Design a protein around this motif. Structure first.
Motif, PDB file in Angstrom:
ATOM      1  N   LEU B 185      47.728  75.422 -50.756  1.00 40.48           N
ATOM      2  CA  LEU B 185      48.450  75.776 -51.973  1.00 40.48           C
ATOM      3  C   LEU B 185      48.173  74.763 -53.077  1.00 40.48           C
ATOM      4  O   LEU B 185      48.021  75.127 -54.249  1.00 40.48           O
ATOM      5  CB  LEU B 185      49.948  75.859 -51.697  1.00 40.48           C
ATOM      6  CG  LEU B 185      50.815  76.038 -52.938  1.00 40.48           C
ATOM      7  CD1 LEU B 185      50.457  77.330 -53.650  1.00 40.48           C
ATOM      8  CD2 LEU B 185      52.280  76.015 -52.557  1.00 40.48           C
ATOM      9  N   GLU B 186      48.061  73.496 -52.695  1.00 33.48           N
ATOM     10  CA  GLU B 186      47.942  72.435 -53.682  1.00 33.48           C
ATOM     11  C   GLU B 186      46.549  72.408 -54.279  1.00 33.48           C
ATOM     12  O   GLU B 186      46.377  72.173 -55.473  1.00 33.48           O
ATOM     13  CB  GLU B 186      48.382  71.070 -53.151  1.00 33.48           C
ATOM     14  CG  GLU B 186      49.882  70.854 -53.134  1.00 33.48           C
ATOM     15  CD  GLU B 186      50.261  69.531 -52.498  1.00 33.48           C
ATOM     16  OE1 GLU B 186      49.570  68.526 -52.777  1.00 33.48           O
ATOM     17  OE2 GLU B 186      51.238  69.496 -51.712  1.00 33.48           O
ATOM     18  N   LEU B 187      45.557  72.630 -53.424  1.00 33.98           N
ATOM     19  CA  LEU B 187      44.174  72.674 -53.858  1.00 33.98           C
ATOM     20  C   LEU B 187      44.016  73.847 -54.809  1.00 33.98           C
ATOM     21  O   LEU B 187      43.398  73.718 -55.862  1.00 33.98           O
ATOM     22  CB  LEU B 187      43.205  72.869 -52.694  1.00 33.98           C
ATOM     23  CG  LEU B 187      41.906  72.063 -52.699  1.00 33.98           C
ATOM     24  CD1 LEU B 187      40.845  72.787 -51.886  1.00 33.98           C
ATOM     25  CD2 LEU B 187      41.407  71.785 -54.108  1.00 33.98           C
ATOM     26  N   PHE B 188      44.578  74.993 -54.424  1.00 37.16           N
ATOM     27  CA  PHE B 188      44.480  76.189 -55.250  1.00 37.16           C
ATOM     28  C   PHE B 188      45.122  75.957 -56.616  1.00 37.16           C
ATOM     29  O   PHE B 188      44.568  76.352 -57.650  1.00 37.16           O
ATOM     30  CB  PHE B 188      45.156  77.384 -54.579  1.00 37.16           C
ATOM     31  CG  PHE B 188      44.820  78.697 -55.222  1.00 37.16           C
ATOM     32  CD1 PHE B 188      43.599  79.308 -54.973  1.00 37.16           C
ATOM     33  CD2 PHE B 188      45.711  79.316 -56.079  1.00 37.16           C
ATOM     34  CE1 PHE B 188      43.270  80.513 -55.565  1.00 37.16           C
ATOM     35  CE2 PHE B 188      45.387  80.525 -56.675  1.00 37.16           C
ATOM     36  CZ  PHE B 188      44.163  81.124 -56.414  1.00 37.16           C
ATOM     37  N   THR B 246      39.910  86.778 -61.753  1.00 43.11           N
ATOM     38  CA  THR B 246      38.908  85.903 -62.377  1.00 43.11           C
ATOM     39  C   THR B 246      38.730  84.610 -61.575  1.00 43.11           C
ATOM     40  O   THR B 246      37.607  84.170 -61.325  1.00 43.11           O
ATOM     41  CB  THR B 246      39.354  85.512 -63.794  1.00 43.11           C
ATOM     42  OG1 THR B 246      39.653  86.695 -64.546  1.00 43.11           O
ATOM     43  CG2 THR B 246      38.251  84.741 -64.504  1.00 43.11           C
ATOM     44  N   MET B 247      39.853  84.017 -61.177  1.00 47.61           N
ATOM     45  CA  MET B 247      39.875  82.778 -60.402  1.00 47.61           C
ATOM     46  C   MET B 247      39.265  82.903 -59.020  1.00 47.61           C
ATOM     47  O   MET B 247      38.625  81.971 -58.539  1.00 47.61           O
ATOM     48  CB  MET B 247      41.283  82.190 -60.304  1.00 47.61           C
ATOM     49  CG  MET B 247      41.671  81.271 -61.446  1.00 47.61           C
ATOM     50  SD  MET B 247      40.297  80.636 -62.430  1.00 47.61           S
ATOM     51  CE  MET B 247      39.663  79.337 -61.368  1.00 47.61           C
ATOM     52  N   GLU B 248      39.457  84.048 -58.376  1.00 51.28           N
ATOM     53  CA  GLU B 248      38.912  84.193 -57.034  1.00 51.28           C
ATOM     54  C   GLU B 248      37.402  84.265 -57.183  1.00 51.28           C
ATOM     55  O   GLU B 248      36.661  83.572 -56.474  1.00 51.28           O
ATOM     56  CB  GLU B 248      39.483  85.417 -56.320  1.00 51.28           C
ATOM     57  CG  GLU B 248      38.478  86.201 -55.478  1.00 51.28           C
ATOM     58  CD  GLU B 248      39.006  87.564 -55.051  1.00 51.28           C
ATOM     59  OE1 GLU B 248      39.660  88.240 -55.874  1.00 51.28           O
ATOM     60  OE2 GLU B 248      38.776  87.955 -53.886  1.00 51.28           O
ATOM     61  N   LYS B 249      36.956  85.098 -58.120  1.00 51.80           N
ATOM     62  CA  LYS B 249      35.527  85.249 -58.376  1.00 51.80           C
ATOM     63  C   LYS B 249      34.884  83.888 -58.686  1.00 51.80           C
ATOM     64  O   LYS B 249      33.831  83.533 -58.142  1.00 51.80           O
ATOM     65  CB  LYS B 249      35.312  86.283 -59.484  1.00 51.80           C
ATOM     66  CG  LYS B 249      33.867  86.469 -59.916  1.00 51.80           C
ATOM     67  CD  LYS B 249      33.788  87.368 -61.142  1.00 51.80           C
ATOM     68  CE  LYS B 249      34.564  88.660 -60.929  1.00 51.80           C
ATOM     69  NZ  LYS B 249      34.628  89.489 -62.165  1.00 51.80           N
ATOM     70  N   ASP B 312      37.619  78.395 -46.434  1.00 47.64           N
ATOM     71  CA  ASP B 312      39.058  78.273 -46.186  1.00 47.64           C
ATOM     72  C   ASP B 312      39.911  78.764 -47.347  1.00 47.64           C
ATOM     73  O   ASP B 312      40.827  79.555 -47.148  1.00 47.64           O
ATOM     74  CB  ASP B 312      39.409  76.821 -45.853  1.00 47.64           C
ATOM     75  CG  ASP B 312      38.680  76.311 -44.625  1.00 47.64           C
ATOM     76  OD1 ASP B 312      38.570  77.074 -43.642  1.00 47.64           O
ATOM     77  OD2 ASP B 312      38.223  75.147 -44.642  1.00 47.64           O
ATOM     78  N   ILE B 313      39.630  78.281 -48.551  1.00 46.75           N
ATOM     79  CA  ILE B 313      40.455  78.626 -49.702  1.00 46.75           C
ATOM     80  C   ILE B 313      40.285  80.098 -50.076  1.00 46.75           C
ATOM     81  O   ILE B 313      41.255  80.774 -50.426  1.00 46.75           O
ATOM     82  CB  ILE B 313      40.182  77.700 -50.906  1.00 46.75           C
ATOM     83  CG1 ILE B 313      40.449  76.247 -50.517  1.00 46.75           C
ATOM     84  CG2 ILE B 313      41.040  78.092 -52.098  1.00 46.75           C
ATOM     85  CD1 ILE B 313      41.889  75.982 -50.117  1.00 46.75           C
ATOM     86  N   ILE B 314      39.056  80.599 -49.972  1.00 50.03           N
ATOM     87  CA  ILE B 314      38.792  82.006 -50.249  1.00 50.03           C
ATOM     88  C   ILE B 314      39.604  82.908 -49.327  1.00 50.03           C
ATOM     89  O   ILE B 314      40.201  83.899 -49.770  1.00 50.03           O
ATOM     90  CB  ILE B 314      37.293  82.366 -50.198  1.00 50.03           C
ATOM     91  CG1 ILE B 314      36.520  81.587 -51.263  1.00 50.03           C
ATOM     92  CG2 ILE B 314      37.099  83.850 -50.451  1.00 50.03           C
ATOM     93  CD1 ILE B 314      35.064  82.012 -51.416  1.00 50.03           C
ATOM     94  N   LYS B 315      39.693  82.534 -48.054  1.00 48.52           N
ATOM     95  CA  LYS B 315      40.421  83.395 -47.132  1.00 48.52           C
ATOM     96  C   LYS B 315      41.927  83.177 -47.224  1.00 48.52           C
ATOM     97  O   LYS B 315      42.683  84.107 -46.977  1.00 48.52           O
ATOM     98  CB  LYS B 315      39.944  83.284 -45.676  1.00 48.52           C
ATOM     99  CG  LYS B 315      39.912  81.897 -45.066  1.00 48.52           C
ATOM    100  CD  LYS B 315      38.745  81.818 -44.077  1.00 48.52           C
ATOM    101  CE  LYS B 315      38.614  80.450 -43.419  1.00 48.52           C
ATOM    102  NZ  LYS B 315      37.380  80.341 -42.579  1.00 48.52           N
TER     103      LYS B 315
END
Lengths: 375, 374
Positions: B185-188, B246-249, B312-315
């Motif tokens: 959560l924090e990285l995101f 946009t952010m996921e892409k 990891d973050i993508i999933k």
């Protein structure tokens, strides 16, 4: 646990008179000191006398403690009892009465106007003598039941100090009440009802007390077993699990019609008419105190019951009850005989149980179920 | 919500003297009637003055009400305020003090013997003057947070009567705190932190106030957005959702080194040493009041942080945040402007939200999370 309960029954000729004296006395009570000391002493003794209850009453008690968000143990109450003085009680009474909500069921030989009359007499008496005002809707707390995790098994172990017998209660919690979950669980209890007596008591003599059936609390439900025995709990456990598997196999193997017989028998029991006033009163009161207000529940549930098949129960069982069920939620209460230490069909391998050391930690670490929606 | 809070700070030369006066007076207080009437009146007004707070302060307040098991509204307090008489308060005070548990952090230029001394001074003064006895372990209730159902979206709507702007808060509840969920959560939040300001404010001009970040309460956490705007809420919603995509892409498309830059930056932010006494005290107090007592959390979590990859973050995102995520839990608070009624990258189609009509029903009808283990 929610307040106070008052029931007046009988011929209504004089009934408003008795009720009115009670409420007047309720709301202006003056404690005579000698009486206070004596009744306090009696309550103290009754708190102590719990150690001498039967093993199965114990098992039920601890299961109750385990499953409700908030529940005070007999020990906590006893301990807390000594800080109760006359002044303190005298101060407690007006505070208790200062804000109230009243839910009433008036049922029998009375008119609407007379009911409204009686209700308003109660309200007015409380206002006049105790200055009661309404409670806020949000302060109408109901307690929730601890929600057990998928695939877990918890054991709670305790010793009975008096009796050289054991008691066990085994609880397979299922889910919130609803038409289908209720008739699934009830049908299953119905099917296993007589096989359990004949195997676990008459043949295997697991104990004098052998009980099985639905457990319902706080809008959630599940299957429970209560047994009292000379044999140690871990064995009882293993015998119940073996019984359960024999039962699933037996349900798979049984013909459509025996199944329909179970349906018809459960159905007649559920649609069974109250034969006297106070039994009907009891049904409606049950619908009211749980705040489900499902007054027509018997017809709905039976109608739905008649729709059910072998398939349904088989997959219910596979989902919720089998040893390897994806949603098994099993908790067990073991009450050891004073002395006990800590052919036949095949008992399945069980997982290592988690032994509960402390109720508060156990509760804190688990979710709580919702409350059930009204109607 | 748990009782009472006292903090005494400053030079320790005379600090026990002040402390002793405070607690002794706490435990033997005699109320002047005029003062009572005056302060009660002031409090009545302050309860009223909530209507003039900012739209985003409202949004935070209602999200707070929505997400906590038990919370009294300002309105309920106001109503309840009229039954407060002198007798009732006078009776309340000794009762409040009659049973207590005290948790204390003493930190600074003082010895252990002096700490025990101060603690014991407090205990003895309370015993002497208010007859305090210990609370039972079982009576230490902490409140839990409402657990939102998989794939749901609920909206709660209210009107601000004073300000002619709107505010929205959007909360994506994820799960309980633990090392990995926390650093995900924090990285995101760290990664999306500046793109959001630059896109939603600087480019698209959705409003002056645009905020994003972790929300942590009652041992639970999640991602939040707070905005105050001239634009209507449903639009804010659609723009935030388009931004999230946009952010996921953008996270998919970024290089190993940029990713490690975000990691290194979060790392530095987390490892920042407190620069004065009261900030360290605040940190420890935070560790204490939540009863998580994870004092070395920063090092564990940063060490673990350095191990994480784009995958990891993508999933994580795909699991918890995306519009079609199997575990999306979205709640929104809409505060309408007084006057308000009840290219750009591409906003996804959104489902029909469930509208909360009454907070109590909403709460009654949902599960509660555990408390976090100590």
């Amino acid at each position: 646990i929610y307040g106070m309960y008052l029931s007046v029954k009988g011929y209504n000729d004089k009934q408003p008179i008795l009720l009115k004296k009670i409420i007047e006395k309720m709301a202006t009570f003056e404690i005579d000191e000698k009486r206070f000391e004596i009744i306090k002493e009696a309550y103290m003794r009754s708190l102590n006398n719990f150690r001498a209850e039967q093993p199965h009453q114990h098992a039920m008690y601890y299961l109750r403690l385990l499953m409700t968000e908030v529940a005070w143990t007999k020990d906590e109450l006893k301990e807390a009892l000594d800080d109760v003085t006359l002044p303190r009680l005298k101060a407690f009474i007006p505070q208790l009465l200062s804000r109230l909500h009243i839910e009433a069921l008036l049922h029998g030989n009375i008119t609407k106007q007379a009911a409204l009359g009686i209700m308003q007499m109660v309200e007015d008496t409380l206002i006049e003598h105790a200055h009661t005002k309404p409670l806020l809707p949000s302060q109408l707390v109901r307690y929730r039941e601890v929600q057990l995790p998928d695939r877990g098994w918890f054991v709670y172990q305790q010793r009975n100090e008096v009796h050289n017998n054991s008691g066990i209660e085994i609880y397979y919690q299922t889910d919130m009440q609803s038409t289908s979950e209720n008739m699934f669980l009830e049908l299953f209890a119905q099917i296993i009802s007589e096989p359990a007596f004949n195997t676990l008591r008459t043949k295997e003599q697991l104990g004098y007390i052998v009980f099985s059936g639905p457990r319902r609390a706080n809008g959630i439900q599940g299957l429970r077993f209560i047994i009292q025995s000379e044999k140690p709990p871990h064995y009882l456990e293993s015998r119940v699990e073996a019984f359960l598997i024999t039962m699933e196999k037996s349900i798979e193997d049984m013909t459509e019609e025996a199944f329909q017989k179970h349906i018809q028998a459960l159905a007649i029991r559920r649609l069974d008419k109250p034969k006297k006033l106070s039994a009907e009163s009891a049904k409606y009161w049950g619908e009211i105190i749980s705040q489900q207000y499902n007054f027509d529940r018997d017809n709905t549930e039976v109608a739905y019951l008649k729709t059910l098949t072998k398939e349904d129960i088989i997959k219910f069982y596979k989902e919720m009850l089998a040893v390897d069920a994806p949603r098994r939620h099993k908790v067990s209460v073991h009450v050891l005989a004073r002395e006990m230490d800590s052919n036949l069909s095949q008992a399945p391998a069980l997982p290592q149980p988690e032994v509960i050391q402390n109720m508060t930690e156990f509760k804190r670490g688990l979710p709580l179920f919702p409350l059930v929606k009204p109607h």
